[PDB]
Ligand binder design. Structure first.
Ligand SMILES: [Zn+2]
Ligand SMILES: [Zn+2]
Length: 55
């Protein structure tokens, strides 16, 4: 109990994805990066997203 975490005045918060203040990328609503725009899955660009295999 009372593990603690953060506690300081004049906190500085700035997102790494969109660059705006008051939040972090975990809390952000900007489009998800580092993943395909055509299927939504991680680890590739959508030109490597060739026809999908059966099951
Ligand atoms: Zn953001
Ligand atoms: Zn894809």
């Amino acid at each position: 109990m009372q593990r603690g975490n953060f506690r300081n005045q004049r906190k500085i918060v700035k997102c790494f994805n969109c660059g705006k203040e008051g939040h972090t990328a975990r809390n952000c609503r900007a489009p998800r990066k580092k993943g395909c725009w055509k299927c939504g899955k991680e680890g590739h660009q959508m030109k490597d997203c060739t026809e999908r295999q059966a099951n």
